[PDB]
């Protein structure tokens, strides 16, 4: 009885040792990321619509004239980067000023 | 028997008698005598399937005899009747066999370019079928990577298949192209190309309309459909697409704001990603209804991770921490109320002392918190579908535990009403479960979340 | 080895202590709220609970005040 | 009983050397391939 | 004298079908499967069975 109980303990230790840890070291990151994102969205949905509109991410940038010349006025979100490989390839078409 | 063999081997020579015979006996090739009982297949599909080196010498002769006999229309587009191939037309066979010459030759004489192949065989793999291509000739041409046939079908003098038509399911050509979309390079490579081709063509022809803004019966759109199905190759392509041509630059979703030396500031369009609870944002569908296997990778696309981080910074951290503080204070009050309970006497107790008033305030606030936990958790569980394996660890277990704790508090109230002995049996379990549940809020900190 | 000792003491030891304290304080409140007779007695019973954690205790103490069954399940958990 | 619970179909492959049918117990598997387009074709059913 | 045939095709969906004349015989002609699962070489059985 005692020996077999110890054997079960040892076997459980081994199974947690290799199979669980090898997978966990990668899966825990992603599961936590999913939990974080879903909590963020839940917190958003808690607030009323007008408050959500007040705390809306992104700008009110205008992109350009439409088919009839009317402005686009699309809510965008800017990200910037540093690149040293492609030099003066294309240019910023919108602000035309940093 | 005879005619099916003649047409099956491509034997143009052996059709000499046919034309005199049909006139002599007042018979047509579409009459029931010449068609499969099981499937209703007429001579023309039989001829197109038995293609010898891509060319069967009897299709023109069959069509000539059909018009000469008076009923071309009924002949060129005769659907199948067996439940397994319902609706399939000779045009579908011509397009599927990948012979542009016969699709042209067949549409030139009045082939319906809008007939729907909706039999059991032509259904999504999840619904008992081996190929779902959008249920339409143009969708068939686009989904099997034949750009030339699409270019011909949309633009020909006889009859043009417009790109905005929807099938029975509501899926436009773009939902159909997303449906076959896969994450292998060999697939995405042409899926994205055909998607862009069709979008630009539809925009140029019909300027006012946006093809991508047509929803199917489920209310999804090509991007929103690729979000909840697990299609990275087309999802990120749609998000990052930029059209340089000035004619149709407006249908792009990533613009270049400004530049200075090696510093390029671009800006992504979030017209659909973040809508603020008005038009079924893509982000909510991606975080709740998406495919669990590939959600981790859908959430790493260029403008989504930064968006989530920005929202966390703007209003996420303070609200979560305020929530943590409130919950901890509520449980401290619950513990204090439990500790001070006079164990001598059968309730309800007379509330006369200021300490008794404090205890009554604790008792009532406990029930308020319990009914609050019931209210918001039930709302969440009703709002979101029941999860399965690989999703329990994310959030399911915590709403389960919170429900159990709320139920325990509610039954504690009932027992406390009359039965002296009963209510103390499980009210302690209430505290135990609540302190267990306080583990929920460790997800804010990554180190504690893991 | 010095690095190991330092990191073990600082990084995860306090983390484990926080979680362990969480469960300990929850059980202290739950266990002592059930008892029927006070801060001094609270200390004696907390010390007794710690003694049971280390592996020695009094059986009659646990069953001294009512509901032995719930006490047994609570201690087992 | 094993014969009753036998896997596979009773598909006929084609005419033998003397034209007699093969009638071999086969077992079908299907695949999706996007690389080789219309390379060869199904010789047996000639219908999905 | 072949043991894998191509049943049918439609676009990118090819259904072929393997001959199991010897793999599964139902206890009449010493099926290959029983010999592979019992009498085979232990080192490489895991790969023969895939
Ligand atoms: C102290 C007080 C009143 O602020 C409070 C707040 N929340 C709870 N929980 C937490 C919880 C746990 C399980 C997931 C839930 C349902 C997701 N979920 C559903 N709606 C949400 C709103 C905000 C957040 C956050 N952060 C999470 C939400 C939340 O169920 C509860 O009742 C308990 N007490």
Numbering used by the authors:
A (entry chain A): 702 to 799
B (entry chain A): 152 to 601
C (entry chain D): 602 to 638, 662 to 701
D (entry chain B): 752 to 799
E (entry chain B): 402 to 451
What does the paper say about this structure?
TRPV4, expressed in the plasma membrane of a wide range of cell types, is a polymodal ion channel whose gating is controlled by multiple endogenous lipids, and exogenous stimuli including synthetic ligands, cell swelling, shear stress, moderate heat, and ultraviolet light. Human TRPV4 adopts a two-layered homotetrameric architecture where RhoA attaches to the bottom layer. RhoA appears to act as an auxiliary subunit, interacting with the ARD through three loops connecting AR2-AR3, AR3-AR4, AR4-AR5, and with the membrane bilayer through the prenylated C-terminal tail.
Three additional complex structures were determined in the presence of distinct ligands: the antagonist GSK2798745-bound TRPV4-RhoA complex in the closed state, the agonist GSK1016790A-bound TRPV4-RhoA in the open state, and the agonist 4α-phorbol 12,13-didecanoate-bound TRPV4-RhoA in the putative open state (ligands are abbreviated as GSK279, GSK101, and 4α–PDD, respectively). The GSK279-bound closed state adopts a wide-set SF (I678-G679-M680) and the narrowest constriction point of the S6 gate is at M718. The diagonal distance between G679 backbone carbonyls in the SF (12.2 Å) is too far to directly coordinate cations, while that between the M718 sidechains (4.9 Å) is too narrow for ion conduction. We observed that D743A and D546A mutations of TRPV4DM attenuate channel inhibition by GSK279 in our two-electrode voltage-clamp (TEVC) recordings. Although the EM density for the ARDs in all three states exhibited high quality, that for RhoA was most well resolved in the GSK279-bound closed state, which we used to unambiguously model RhoA and map its interaction with TRPV4. We resolved GDP within the RhoA-TRPV4 signaling complex in the GSK279-bound closed state, and by including GTPγS before freezing grids we observed density consistent with GTPγS in the open state. The interfacial contact that associates TRPV4 and RhoA is mediated principally by electrostatic interactions between β1 and β3, switch I, and switch II in RhoA and AR2-AR5 in TRPV4. Strikingly, most residues mutated in TRPV4-mediated neuropathy (R237, R269, R315, and R316) are clustered at the interface with RhoA. Consistent with this idea, the all-atom MD simulations showed that RhoA binding reduced the ARD fluctuation substantially in the GSK279-bound closed state based on the root-mean-square-fluctuation (RMSF) plot. Importantly, our discoveries of the human TRPV4 structure bound to the clinical candidate antagonist GSK279, as well as the molecular mechanisms of ligand-dependent TRPV4 gating will facilitate the development of drugs targeting TRPV4.
